[PDB]
Protein backbone atom coordinates (compact mmCIF):
# COMPACT_ATOMS: atom_id res chain seq x y z
CA UNK A 1 0.00 0.00 0.00
CA UNK A 2 3.02 2.34 0.79
CA UNK A 3 6.68 2.41 -0.54
CA UNK A 4 10.05 4.12 0.39
CA UNK A 5 11.21 6.68 -2.27
CA UNK A 6 14.70 8.39 -2.36
CA UNK A 7 15.27 11.59 -4.48
CA UNK A 8 17.39 12.47 -7.60
CA UNK A 9 12.12 26.14 -27.89
CA UNK A 10 9.87 28.73 -29.62
CA UNK A 11 7.70 25.87 -31.01
CA UNK A 12 4.36 27.24 -29.67
CA UNK A 13 4.68 30.36 -31.99
CA UNK A 14 6.45 28.78 -35.07
CA UNK A 15 3.78 26.02 -35.25
CA UNK A 16 1.06 25.62 -37.94
CA UNK A 17 -1.10 24.57 -34.94
CA UNK A 18 0.13 27.27 -32.48
CA UNK A 19 -0.54 27.10 -28.72
CA UNK A 20 -0.66 29.23 -25.59
CA UNK A 21 1.08 28.06 -22.39
CA UNK A 22 -0.86 28.52 -19.10
CA UNK A 23 1.17 28.11 -15.89
CA UNK A 24 -0.32 25.73 -13.31
CA UNK A 25 1.06 25.94 -9.75
CA UNK A 26 0.50 23.90 -6.53
CA UNK A 27 3.27 24.01 -3.81
CA UNK A 28 1.61 20.81 -2.48
CA UNK A 29 2.53 18.96 -5.73
CA UNK A 30 5.76 17.68 -7.34
CA UNK A 31 6.39 19.01 -10.00
CA UNK A 32 5.03 22.14 -8.38
CA UNK A 33 4.83 23.90 -11.81
CA UNK A 34 3.33 22.45 -14.97
CA UNK A 35 2.80 24.59 -18.08
CA UNK A 36 -0.23 23.44 -20.08
CA UNK A 37 -0.74 23.94 -23.85
CA UNK A 38 -4.06 25.33 -25.15
CA UNK A 39 -4.46 25.50 -29.00
CA UNK A 40 -4.48 29.08 -30.17
CA UNK A 41 -6.58 28.51 -33.36
CA UNK A 42 -9.37 26.03 -34.39
CA UNK A 43 -7.79 25.57 -37.83
CA UNK A 44 -4.18 25.77 -39.00
CA UNK A 45 -1.85 28.45 -40.23
CA UNK A 46 -1.02 28.16 -43.94
CA UNK A 47 1.69 29.50 -46.34
CA UNK A 48 -0.15 32.94 -46.53
CA UNK A 49 -0.28 33.19 -42.69
CA UNK A 50 -4.03 32.84 -41.96
CA UNK A 51 -6.42 30.24 -40.30
CA UNK A 52 -7.21 27.34 -42.77
CA UNK A 53 -10.37 25.72 -41.36
CA UNK A 54 -9.78 22.62 -43.65
CA UNK A 55 -7.27 21.41 -41.01
CA UNK A 56 -7.50 21.33 -37.15
CA UNK A 57 -5.25 22.17 -34.15
CA UNK A 58 -5.29 19.29 -31.70
CA UNK A 59 -3.53 19.16 -28.34
CA UNK A 60 -1.14 16.23 -27.67
CA UNK A 61 -1.99 14.87 -24.20
CA UNK A 62 0.24 12.75 -21.83
CA UNK A 63 -0.60 10.84 -18.57
CA UNK A 64 2.15 12.08 -16.16
CA UNK A 65 3.09 10.94 -12.63
CA UNK A 66 2.77 13.58 -9.81
CA UNK A 67 3.33 13.47 -6.01
CA UNK A 68 1.04 15.17 -3.47
CA UNK A 69 1.24 16.01 0.28
CA UNK A 70 -0.92 13.19 1.87
CA UNK A 71 -2.24 13.85 4.68
CA UNK A 72 -3.07 17.29 3.16
CA UNK A 73 -0.26 19.83 4.05
CA UNK A 74 1.85 16.98 5.78
CA UNK A 75 5.38 17.85 4.39
CA UNK A 76 7.03 14.38 4.81
CA UNK A 77 4.45 11.95 3.29
CA UNK A 78 3.19 11.70 -0.32
CA UNK A 79 0.66 10.06 -2.62
CA UNK A 80 1.36 9.15 -6.26
CA UNK A 81 -1.19 10.44 -8.81
CA UNK A 82 -1.72 10.43 -12.59
CA UNK A 83 -2.74 13.67 -14.33
CA UNK A 84 -3.52 14.29 -18.03
CA UNK A 85 -1.43 17.34 -19.27
CA UNK A 86 -1.42 18.78 -22.89
CA UNK A 87 2.16 19.40 -24.01
CA UNK A 88 1.59 21.07 -27.38
CA UNK A 89 -0.56 21.07 -30.50
CA UNK A 90 -0.43 19.32 -33.85
CA UNK A 91 -2.27 19.92 -37.16
CA UNK A 92 -4.56 17.10 -38.33
CA UNK A 93 -6.86 16.25 -41.24
CA UNK A 94 -10.43 15.34 -40.16
CA UNK A 95 -11.74 11.76 -39.83
Amino acid sequence: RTVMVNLNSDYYNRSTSPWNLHRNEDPERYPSVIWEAKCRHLGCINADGNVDYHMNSVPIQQEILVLRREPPHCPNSFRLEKILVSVGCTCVTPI
Epitope: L7, R23, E25, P27, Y30, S32, V33
Partner: antibody, heavy 116, light 108 residues
Framework: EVQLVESGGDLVQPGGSLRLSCAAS????????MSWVRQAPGKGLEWVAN????????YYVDSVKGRFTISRDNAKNSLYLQMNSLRAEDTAVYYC?????????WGQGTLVTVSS | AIQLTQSPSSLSASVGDRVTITCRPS??????LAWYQQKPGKAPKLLIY???SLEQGVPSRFSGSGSGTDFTLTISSLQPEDFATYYC?????????FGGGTKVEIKW
Protein backbone atom coordinates in the same frame (compact mmCIF):
# COMPACT_ATOMS: atom_id res chain seq x y z
CA GLU B 1 0.05 38.93 -21.73
CA VAL B 2 -0.87 38.52 -18.03
CA GLN B 3 -0.94 41.97 -16.35
CA LEU B 4 -0.67 42.91 -12.66
CA VAL B 5 -0.94 46.63 -11.84
CA GLU B 6 -0.56 47.88 -8.27
CA SER B 7 -1.97 51.22 -6.91
CA GLY B 8 -2.92 52.87 -3.61
CA GLY B 9 0.63 53.24 -2.30
CA ASP B 10 1.25 56.74 -0.82
CA LEU B 11 2.82 58.63 2.12
CA VAL B 12 0.74 57.91 5.25
CA GLN B 13 1.65 58.92 8.88
CA PRO B 14 2.27 56.01 11.42
CA GLY B 15 -0.86 54.51 12.96
CA GLY B 16 -2.80 55.44 9.78
CA SER B 17 -4.37 53.24 7.07
CA LEU B 18 -4.22 52.70 3.23
CA ARG B 19 -5.77 50.27 0.65
CA LEU B 20 -3.60 48.68 -2.01
CA SER B 21 -5.15 47.56 -5.27
CA CYS B 22 -3.67 45.01 -7.66
CA ALA B 23 -5.54 45.10 -10.99
CA ALA B 24 -5.38 41.74 -12.75
CA SER B 25 -5.97 41.12 -16.48
CA UNK B 26 -4.93 38.47 -19.04
CA UNK B 27 -6.27 35.40 -17.16
CA UNK B 28 -9.23 33.83 -15.30
CA UNK B 29 -8.39 35.79 -12.09
CA UNK B 30 -11.09 33.70 -10.30
CA UNK B 31 -9.17 30.36 -10.91
CA UNK B 32 -5.66 31.35 -9.52
CA UNK B 33 -4.32 32.18 -5.98
CA MET B 34 -2.73 35.61 -5.40
CA SER B 35 0.06 37.03 -3.19
CA TRP B 36 1.81 40.17 -1.79
CA VAL B 37 5.58 40.28 -1.23
CA ARG B 38 7.33 43.43 -0.03
CA GLN B 39 10.79 44.97 -0.51
CA ALA B 40 11.89 47.51 2.10
CA PRO B 41 14.28 50.29 0.89
CA GLY B 42 17.63 48.60 0.11
CA LYS B 43 16.49 45.33 1.68
CA GLY B 44 15.59 41.75 0.65
CA LEU B 45 12.22 40.27 -0.26
CA GLU B 46 9.70 39.46 2.50
CA TRP B 47 6.64 37.26 1.83
CA VAL B 48 3.56 39.03 3.26
CA ALA B 49 0.16 37.38 2.35
CA ASN B 50 -1.61 35.02 -0.08
CA UNK B 51 -5.36 34.35 -0.75
CA UNK B 52 -7.26 31.27 -2.15
CA UNK B 53 -9.04 31.26 -5.60
CA UNK B 54 -12.48 32.16 -4.03
CA UNK B 55 -11.29 33.77 -0.75
CA UNK B 56 -11.85 30.92 1.79
CA UNK B 57 -8.21 30.47 2.93
CA UNK B 58 -5.64 33.24 3.68
CA TYR B 59 -2.05 33.00 5.11
CA TYR B 60 0.37 35.66 6.55
CA VAL B 61 3.83 36.35 8.03
CA ASP B 62 3.38 37.02 11.85
CA SER B 63 4.78 40.63 11.52
CA VAL B 64 1.44 41.59 9.78
CA LYS B 65 -1.02 39.04 11.39
CA GLY B 66 -4.02 40.98 12.72
CA ARG B 67 -2.82 44.34 11.26
CA PHE B 68 -3.08 43.57 7.49
CA THR B 69 -6.22 42.41 5.59
CA ILE B 70 -6.01 40.64 2.14
CA SER B 71 -9.15 40.42 -0.07
CA ARG B 72 -10.39 39.80 -3.60
CA ASP B 73 -13.18 40.92 -5.95
CA ASN B 74 -13.14 38.16 -8.65
CA ALA B 75 -15.90 40.01 -10.59
CA LYS B 76 -13.80 43.26 -10.61
CA ASN B 77 -10.33 41.50 -11.25
CA SER B 78 -8.79 43.04 -8.15
CA LEU B 79 -6.64 41.99 -5.20
CA TYR B 80 -6.43 44.29 -2.21
CA LEU B 81 -4.33 45.08 0.89
CA GLN B 82 -6.07 46.97 3.67
CA MET B 83 -3.20 47.74 6.03
CA ASN B 84 -3.82 49.48 9.45
CA SER B 85 -1.70 50.87 12.42
CA LEU B 86 1.19 51.35 9.89
CA ARG B 87 4.77 51.16 11.30
CA ALA B 88 8.28 52.21 10.06
CA GLU B 89 9.01 48.57 9.02
CA ASP B 90 5.88 48.75 6.80
CA THR B 91 7.60 51.25 4.35
CA ALA B 92 8.32 49.05 1.36
CA VAL B 93 7.42 48.39 -2.31
CA TYR B 94 4.43 46.10 -2.38
CA TYR B 95 4.42 43.68 -5.26
CA CYS B 96 1.41 41.49 -6.00
CA UNK B 97 2.06 38.14 -7.76
CA UNK B 98 -0.04 35.31 -9.09
CA UNK B 99 0.15 31.70 -7.58
CA UNK B 100 1.28 30.74 -4.06
CA UNK B 101 4.64 28.91 -3.89
CA UNK B 102 6.78 30.00 -6.89
CA UNK B 103 5.83 33.38 -8.28
CA UNK B 104 6.33 33.96 -12.02
CA UNK B 105 3.75 36.66 -12.68
CA TRP B 106 4.73 39.89 -10.77
CA GLY B 107 3.41 43.45 -10.78
CA GLN B 108 5.68 46.50 -11.01
CA GLY B 109 5.20 47.42 -7.36
CA THR B 110 3.68 50.28 -5.32
CA LEU B 111 5.61 52.33 -2.74
CA VAL B 112 3.90 52.73 0.58
CA THR B 113 5.68 55.47 2.59
CA VAL B 114 5.08 55.60 6.40
CA SER B 115 7.11 58.32 8.28
CA SER B 116 7.00 61.68 10.22
CA ALA C 1 9.54 29.94 10.54
CA ILE C 2 11.97 28.17 8.11
CA GLN C 3 14.85 30.66 7.92
CA LEU C 4 16.90 30.85 4.72
CA THR C 5 20.63 31.51 5.05
CA GLN C 6 22.15 32.65 1.74
CA SER C 7 25.89 32.46 1.00
CA PRO C 8 27.62 34.86 0.39
CA SER C 9 25.56 38.06 0.85
CA SER C 10 27.74 39.70 -1.87
CA LEU C 11 30.35 38.53 -4.42
CA SER C 12 32.52 40.07 -7.18
CA ALA C 13 32.93 38.19 -10.50
CA SER C 14 33.83 38.79 -14.25
CA VAL C 15 32.07 37.90 -17.63
CA GLY C 16 32.51 34.16 -18.33
CA ASP C 17 32.98 33.08 -14.65
CA ARG C 18 31.23 30.26 -12.76
CA VAL C 19 29.16 31.68 -9.88
CA THR C 20 27.96 29.17 -7.19
CA ILE C 21 25.49 30.65 -4.67
CA THR C 22 24.37 28.44 -1.77
CA CYS C 23 21.05 28.44 0.11
CA ARG C 24 20.82 26.56 3.40
CA PRO C 25 17.39 26.38 5.22
CA SER C 26 17.20 26.42 9.08
CA UNK C 27 15.38 22.99 9.00
CA UNK C 28 14.95 20.21 6.40
CA UNK C 29 13.13 20.70 3.08
CA UNK C 30 12.58 18.13 0.27
CA UNK C 31 12.68 20.11 -3.06
CA UNK C 32 10.39 23.02 -2.05
CA LEU C 33 12.89 25.79 -3.01
CA ALA C 34 12.86 28.56 -5.71
CA TRP C 35 15.51 31.00 -7.07
CA TYR C 36 15.04 34.51 -8.47
CA GLN C 37 17.04 37.27 -10.24
CA GLN C 38 16.37 40.97 -9.44
CA LYS C 39 17.81 43.87 -11.39
CA PRO C 40 17.53 47.52 -10.15
CA GLY C 41 14.08 48.96 -10.65
CA LYS C 42 12.53 45.71 -11.69
CA ALA C 43 10.30 43.05 -10.05
CA PRO C 44 12.13 39.72 -9.44
CA LYS C 45 12.28 37.09 -12.24
CA LEU C 46 11.71 33.40 -11.30
CA LEU C 47 14.61 31.27 -12.48
CA ILE C 48 14.38 27.73 -11.03
CA TYR C 49 11.48 25.93 -9.24
CA UNK C 50 11.53 22.64 -7.29
CA UNK C 51 15.22 23.46 -6.44
CA UNK C 52 16.49 22.06 -9.86
CA SER C 53 13.82 22.84 -12.64
CA LEU C 54 14.46 25.68 -15.09
CA GLU C 55 11.51 28.01 -15.67
CA GLN C 56 9.99 29.01 -19.03
CA GLY C 57 12.40 31.31 -20.93
CA VAL C 58 15.34 31.03 -18.41
CA PRO C 59 18.63 30.23 -20.28
CA SER C 60 20.50 26.91 -20.19
CA ARG C 61 23.51 28.62 -18.40
CA PHE C 62 21.44 28.19 -15.17
CA SER C 63 21.41 25.12 -12.85
CA GLY C 64 19.70 24.56 -9.55
CA SER C 65 20.51 21.64 -7.27
CA GLY C 66 20.82 20.01 -3.83
CA SER C 67 18.36 18.53 -1.33
CA GLY C 68 17.43 18.86 2.37
CA THR C 69 19.83 21.56 3.68
CA ASP C 70 22.20 22.28 0.72
CA PHE C 71 20.89 24.13 -2.37
CA THR C 72 22.98 25.50 -5.21
CA LEU C 73 22.31 28.09 -7.88
CA THR C 74 24.99 27.99 -10.62
CA ILE C 75 25.78 30.30 -13.57
CA SER C 76 28.31 28.29 -15.63
CA SER C 77 29.38 31.13 -17.99
CA LEU C 78 28.53 34.60 -16.63
CA GLN C 79 27.06 37.16 -19.00
CA PRO C 80 26.87 40.99 -18.63
CA GLU C 81 23.07 40.57 -18.64
CA ASP C 82 23.50 38.38 -15.46
CA PHE C 83 24.78 40.89 -12.80
CA ALA C 84 21.90 41.16 -10.31
CA THR C 85 20.77 40.13 -6.83
CA TYR C 86 19.73 36.45 -6.51
CA TYR C 87 17.13 35.32 -3.96
CA CYS C 88 16.28 31.76 -2.74
CA UNK C 89 12.83 31.07 -1.23
CA UNK C 90 11.25 27.95 0.46
CA UNK C 91 7.63 26.83 -0.11
CA UNK C 92 7.84 23.88 2.36
CA UNK C 93 5.64 25.53 5.00
CA UNK C 94 4.03 28.82 5.98
CA UNK C 95 5.30 31.43 6.54
CA UNK C 96 6.98 31.35 3.08
CA UNK C 97 10.43 32.96 3.48
CA PHE C 98 13.14 34.53 1.25
CA GLY C 99 16.89 34.35 1.59
CA GLY C 100 18.79 37.58 2.22
CA GLY C 101 19.95 37.75 -1.41
CA THR C 102 23.39 37.49 -3.09
CA LYS C 103 24.86 40.37 -5.09
CA VAL C 104 26.60 39.09 -8.25
CA GLU C 105 28.56 42.34 -8.68
CA ILE C 106 31.26 43.27 -11.22
CA LYS C 107 34.94 42.75 -10.21
CA TRP C 108 36.76 45.77 -11.68
Amino acid sequence: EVQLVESGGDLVQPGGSLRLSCAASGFTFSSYWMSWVRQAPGKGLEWVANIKQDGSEKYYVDSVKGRFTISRDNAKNSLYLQMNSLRAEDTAVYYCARDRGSLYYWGQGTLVTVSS
Amino acid sequence: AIQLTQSPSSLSASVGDRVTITCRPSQGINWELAWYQQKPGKAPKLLIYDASSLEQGVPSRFSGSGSGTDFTLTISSLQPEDFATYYCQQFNSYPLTFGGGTKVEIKW
